[PDB]
């Protein structure tokens, strides 16, 4: 699924190029083409993910989802240039999908025993959480803000799973970076809470923040055991 | 896109030469030719901008927009010599376009991390704001005055973005000049308010003026941190 | 059953070709097709074996099992390229089956009085024993290692049967090669013992090794009687 | 597959020519064309490899992969001239692919009994390892650095396989050069460790370095046996 | 590309002649013609450079760029006689281009293994750096001063590359002259710093000056090794 | 296939003419055109060969390959004038192909019973062997030297086949010239050994030299039998 | 096919005119044009031959081949003036083709029952045989000499066929001239033998000479029967 992966990668790069040209040209048609190519690439990336899962290659599976995340970003950027609420919706849907697909990669990585892919899989989810906020802000959608909130908090939980795997592996570096991701989530949760105006979300941010500290202490233990 | 840039530069210089000759000759035909060449150069400059953005060269991108700004000036000068309200309109459209294209250059400069191009990009926007006022005065257009007002205020906001970038870079010289641009905007906003007779615009000028002072204090801080 | 044999032979060759293409193409689909064709060929080969037994042709019967052994190898190779534990299991099952079917051929050869087919029948069993080890290693299966151990030791016993037949026939060349097969088993038994970490298996290897020496002395006697 | 090989060779040469012209012309379009032709050539080279494997010609198979390696180099060079992170990614993917395809050639060469093709196959992998580092440096990718590290170390292992084959063949010249490749890997591993800042990678470099010395002693033995 | 080179050389000489006649005649028309011919020659010289690169002739490639440098000088001289800020801009653009094209020649020379062309290629860059300062002074452009500063410092780095090549070749004479070029850069950097009033540029000049001393010590070593 | 043969012959002559003109004109474009036409002619010649084989005309088949050999020479000559390593590679590939195609002609000639075509077919192979050396020298390729070595030695073997055919036919003149070709190979093998620095190749040259003497004695016998 | 015949005739005359002008002008270009037109005419003449054969007109078919023979002569003459070995080859190929096409005309004439066309058809073959010698002499080709030898001898055989037809028709005049052609062949065979230095060819000439005498005796018989 390596050739298939790289094929989709090219499609993602094409979508970016179409955006760049569309902006310079001022062409709504080209912007539409960028949207179609971008989304298509993500859909094809999911096909690559499936193949990678069947093959047992967590690296291709990870990178496949990464491409989907990149599409989600591109869709937002295109939506902004085009001024399309539809495109914003499409970006929102793909973004959340990317997080869900990343969780699938995490599972595979856990089964394989690769804490590096597992870590980066969660990283993608965190990046999505940011994108979901950005999309929610541009669209002005309280629903999207909720979706961002849910995914963000989930990301912290998924990072904790990576910590466990890293601890079992004996890799304090992945464990360290795993906690960093949780801290990033805490930041995102605050930003989401501010944009949404949710005191509940503020509490959730605080809880994850404290969790990060507790998880960091676990990393310290691991480092002591590892040396 | 360097050769392409210089090619368009020659076209801009040609347009100027056509104006100079047209004035000495007293030829309406030559004045028309100057208009066609000037606008064409700006259109080709935008093509160069696109290429520069694709290449990742913020300097060529900046200079491309600069040429468009020079065209806008030339179009005004030609319109005055010809006495053409159409040419004044064309000058107005190109002028505003230049500001919009300059903002694109600013974005690129921010992505590159070049506060010098970012600064000069905003400078071009400020120069456009002046041109928009001058065009509005010659045309006697309240719409053009509004357009000048909007772009001028925007310029101040864009300069503040440059300040942020300069602060992150640690360049107090760009930060200093960024505030200067904001002060220039405040002046332009006053001049626009006077020509339009708008008490609202007067308020906007005052707000930007005070903003400039606040931004200057930020520059002071940066200088203290830099030494 | 000669045409039927050659038909299945083509199927086995097809399975190989599908693997080769699948590897070059990087196609999991083609790898699946290779698995299906390979196993099918073995199943059809068993049908040919049945016909050969009914006909009384020990040569076709032998070659039918040979094809099954080749399938077992192909299934392992395909399993490695695909990374499929299922395919590894399928390879294991077919491999052991091949040995069992080879023993049937041995019986037929003994009834016919053909020590050459009888010898080669056991050779196939020895080849299976090797394949079973290789499969066990790739799968990491202690069960498969046990299965390899049992078949390997059996092979030595079956070779001794060939020796008896060869001695009765008066063919010292088959008798000689029969002992060689036993020595090969002793090697395989050691390799299996090492991979499994079994001191019992080590003893079994030693016993067969000594047996081979004793069987070689029998061959010497036969050669002396034959001249 | 000889005509097909030479056809692809021409495509690779074309890609180079397109780069050279693009640089002299300063054409981003031509640079894009170079990227498309280069990658296409590599894809077609893989098709040639498949044919060569089916034919049983390890020389065409080797040269097919060589072309892919040359493409990887060209893609890097083009990416540098274009300033394209996408092109850098494409170069990275093709480079690693080349190493994987070279390993396939090694397998074929081992089956054929040709230690010269086997050696050169590994040489290509070593060349890829260098390219992977160069690509990682230009892209600034820690992932690419990891990929370079893994392939480099693998190259040493593959060279050791060539040594075995050469020893079995009785060719001390291939054996000698095989060790040289391992030494080159050790150098690359150090360079990768320095760029990545990895103490682990430094250890890996040291281990391969010592391995090379041990492998050289094996070559000495072979030379003594050969005379 | 030798005939093509000499053809362009004639065009450059023509441009000079047009200037000389224009000055004696006092003809602005002829001055314009000189500008058009001069720039055209440089553009054609770049075409010759491309051909030379494709041919593999570093001498023609070098001389092609030399012609471009001569054009840059002529454009400045013409701009001064005409009093044209446009012509000054054109001179600035061509001058910088010449340095960039000279660097391409350096690359070719390094690939060829010709330290003499490599040296002279950098010499041209140094000459451009001087021209850039002279142009900046006549135009009164702080931007041009910056461009001169950047190219000047680059020239020193490029000369150091020549030193490396000369050291590898074993030519202490090229190595010696390479350092001389660096010293000339240090002078130019000071002059630029004085005209620009930049304390940073003064530091850069000092750093290159000290570098030159260090590079001279390397030349001493080379001379000792060479004898 | 006679008209087709002559058509390709014209293409070969065209390629030569293009070279001659390209040299006089100094045109890299024309040199490229010469390369394209030359290679195309060889490809079309192979098509003619196929037709000739189907027709059963060993004379057209021979001359078809002759044209390919002439192309190989032209490609070398063009590569030298252009200074193209790619063209040298193309020449190498076509040269070796010509030898392989000549061997096909030999087979046909043997089946037909024409010792004159058979002889000339091998002559072409010998001419290729020389060309392969010349190409290897110009390219500096040890691989090409190996290829030249292998083809040269093969040529001697193919000449021996011609001797057999000539002996069966009763033609001592073809037999005589066949041995001459072997002697020419021995010379080429020495030259290759000298350029490659291979003591093995020197031995191979000696073996063929002695073989030639032995083959000449066979010719003597044939002459005695013929009268 | 009469109009088509005359059309080609004009083309042949044009080719002659082009030669005559080229010689007077001293133009290599015109000589090339003569070659292209000449060969083209022959190719078109063969098309006319096909049509004539389909129509059943042996006179047009004969004259069509005659034109091809005239082309062969012209090609030789042009080759001599141009000094082109390629043109000599083209002349050789067309010349031999003409003989082959003439034999086709002979067949048609035999089927029609026209001994006059049959005679003249062979005459053309004899004329070709002469041309083949002349071409071989100018080119210095032993192969061409062989081709001339084979065609010459064939001509005698074809003339004997005409004799048979003439005898069946009862035309002693065609029979007489048929033998004359054989005598002319005998002369040509001697000339070829002298140029080639072939004792075999000398024998062949003698055999045909004696044959001519025997054939003349047959003519005598026919004359006696006819009166």
XYZ file of C-alpha atoms in Angstrom, chain B:
227
model
C 9.997 34.433 -11.486
C 12.831 36.967 -11.402
C 13.064 37.406 -15.172
C 9.272 37.638 -15.328
C 9.334 40.260 -12.580
C 11.912 42.366 -14.417
C 9.955 41.978 -17.648
C 6.881 43.480 -15.989
C 9.033 46.170 -14.386
C 10.022 47.240 -17.900
C 6.343 47.365 -18.856
C 5.659 49.639 -15.889
C 8.554 51.887 -16.905
C 7.198 51.899 -20.454
C 3.798 53.040 -19.190
C 5.518 55.907 -17.380
C 7.468 56.817 -20.514
C 4.266 56.755 -22.563
C 2.690 59.195 -20.111
C 5.704 61.507 -20.230
C 5.732 61.490 -24.032
C 1.949 61.825 -24.220
C 2.107 64.934 -22.034
C 4.860 66.527 -24.116
C 3.182 65.543 -27.382
C -0.353 66.288 -26.198
C -1.546 62.969 -27.610
C -4.753 61.376 -26.337
C -3.838 58.256 -28.301
C -0.553 57.927 -26.413
C -2.423 58.507 -23.152
C -4.699 55.601 -24.049
C -1.654 53.466 -24.844
C -0.205 54.403 -21.456
C -3.410 53.253 -19.761
C -3.394 49.932 -21.611
C 0.279 49.250 -20.909
C 0.015 50.315 -17.268
C -2.958 48.074 -16.494
C -1.446 45.211 -18.484
C 1.737 45.480 -16.423
C -0.268 45.216 -13.204
C -2.096 42.163 -14.538
C 1.219 40.560 -15.487
C 2.642 41.516 -12.095
C -0.152 39.519 -10.463
C 0.927 36.567 -12.600
C 4.458 37.057 -11.286
C 3.074 37.203 -7.749
C 1.395 33.830 -8.264
C 4.659 32.329 -9.502
C 6.573 33.873 -6.602
C 4.090 32.405 -4.125
C 4.480 28.978 -5.726
C 8.261 29.356 -5.707
C 8.331 30.594 -2.109
C 10.113 33.868 -2.862
C 8.606 36.665 -0.776
C 10.965 39.253 -2.258
C 9.794 38.781 -5.842
C 6.219 38.560 -4.571
C 6.662 41.861 -2.739
C 8.246 43.607 -5.721
C 5.528 42.262 -8.007
C 2.891 44.011 -5.899
C 5.087 47.107 -5.714
C 4.882 47.288 -9.505
C 1.092 47.096 -9.279
C 1.125 49.985 -6.810
C 3.315 51.975 -9.196
C 0.805 51.252 -11.959
C -2.021 52.544 -9.768
C -0.089 55.787 -9.330
C 0.615 55.996 -13.063
C -3.046 55.359 -13.867
C -4.029 58.280 -11.642
C -1.415 60.533 -13.237
C -2.528 59.477 -16.715
C -6.189 59.925 -15.790
C -5.431 63.478 -14.670
C -3.612 64.337 -17.895
C -6.301 62.711 -20.035
C -9.198 63.916 -17.893
C -10.740 60.445 -17.981
C -13.210 59.331 -15.313
C -12.884 55.808 -16.701
C -9.125 55.897 -16.137
C -9.761 57.161 -12.610
C -12.008 54.156 -12.014
C -9.331 51.843 -13.409
C -6.790 53.463 -11.093
C -9.138 52.962 -8.145
C -9.663 49.281 -8.931
C -5.956 48.569 -9.401
C -5.025 50.522 -6.275
C -7.350 48.493 -4.054
C -6.216 45.297 -5.777
C -2.617 46.198 -4.945
C -3.480 46.404 -1.249
C -5.214 43.024 -1.415
C -2.220 41.508 -3.204
C 0.136 43.102 -0.685
C -1.778 41.346 2.089
C -1.093 38.075 0.280
C 2.604 38.963 0.305
C 2.345 39.704 4.026
C 0.934 36.221 4.603
C 3.797 34.673 2.639
C 6.345 36.772 4.523
C 4.833 35.676 7.836
C 5.050 32.035 6.757
C 8.642 32.541 5.620
C 9.589 34.446 8.769
C 10.760 37.590 6.975
C 9.692 40.686 8.901
C 11.363 42.989 6.379
C 9.201 41.891 3.454
C 6.206 41.786 5.794
C 6.852 45.395 6.798
C 7.315 46.599 3.224
C 4.208 44.691 2.161
C 2.144 46.731 4.615
C 3.975 49.879 3.529
C 2.610 49.259 0.037
C -0.892 48.987 1.497
C -0.396 52.324 3.247
C 0.810 53.841 -0.023
C -2.311 52.482 -1.707
C -4.475 54.047 0.998
C -2.938 57.410 0.125
C -3.452 56.764 -3.583
C -7.073 55.786 -2.951
C -7.663 59.138 -1.263
C -5.947 60.993 -4.104
C -8.020 59.078 -6.653
C -11.208 59.727 -4.685
C -10.401 63.441 -4.634
C -9.754 63.629 -8.375
C -12.834 61.557 -9.194
C -14.994 63.162 -6.509
C -16.242 59.745 -5.413
C -17.670 59.191 -1.936
C -17.478 55.459 -2.627
C -13.756 55.765 -3.336
C -13.379 57.729 -0.106
C -15.039 54.855 1.746
C -12.727 52.375 0.026
C -9.752 54.515 1.033
C -11.036 54.630 4.612
C -11.429 50.856 4.836
C -8.022 50.088 3.335
C -6.280 52.688 5.495
C -7.652 51.223 8.724
C -6.830 47.725 7.488
C -3.256 48.874 6.887
C -2.907 49.719 10.579
C -4.125 46.237 11.493
C -1.680 44.686 9.029
C 1.158 46.754 10.486
C 0.259 45.387 13.915
C 0.678 41.904 12.468
C 4.154 42.922 11.310
C 4.897 44.159 14.828
C 3.992 40.731 16.198
C 6.265 39.021 13.678
C 9.084 41.473 14.380
C 8.654 40.921 18.116
C 8.879 37.156 17.624
C 11.934 37.613 15.409
C 13.541 40.063 17.831
C 13.873 42.917 15.340
C 13.077 46.231 17.020
C 13.839 48.171 13.839
C 11.031 46.581 11.840
C 8.821 46.896 14.918
C 9.631 50.603 15.117
C 8.902 51.207 11.433
C 5.725 49.143 11.704
C 4.346 51.637 14.223
C 5.414 54.503 11.970
C 3.191 53.028 9.264
C 0.277 52.977 11.705
C 0.890 56.649 12.483
C 0.885 57.371 8.752
C -2.460 55.587 8.516
C -3.829 57.764 11.316
C -2.821 60.803 9.276
C -4.450 59.372 6.153
C -7.607 58.548 8.101
C -7.843 62.173 9.218
C -7.336 63.413 5.661
C -9.999 60.997 4.436
C -12.355 62.088 7.213
C -11.851 65.723 6.217
C -12.487 65.067 2.526
C -15.492 62.849 3.243
C -16.766 64.993 6.110
C -17.239 61.917 8.286
C -17.265 62.215 12.078
C -17.099 58.423 12.228
C -13.899 58.463 10.179
C -12.528 61.096 12.555
C -13.165 58.726 15.458
C -11.473 55.898 13.559
C -8.455 58.133 12.986
C -8.289 58.933 16.700
C -8.535 55.256 17.643
C -5.669 54.294 15.338
C -3.616 57.239 16.589
C -3.965 56.040 20.179
C -3.307 52.489 18.998
C -0.034 53.672 17.463
C 1.043 55.042 20.843
C 0.194 51.724 22.493
C 2.065 49.846 19.765
C 5.073 52.122 20.233
C 5.140 51.114 23.898
C 5.304 47.497 22.743
C 8.282 48.446 20.581
C 9.929 49.994 23.638
C 9.496 46.705 25.491
C 11.004 44.798 22.570
C 13.969 47.175 22.478
C 14.501 46.671 26.209
C 14.424 42.895 25.778
C 16.716 43.060 22.751
C 19.053 45.640 24.271
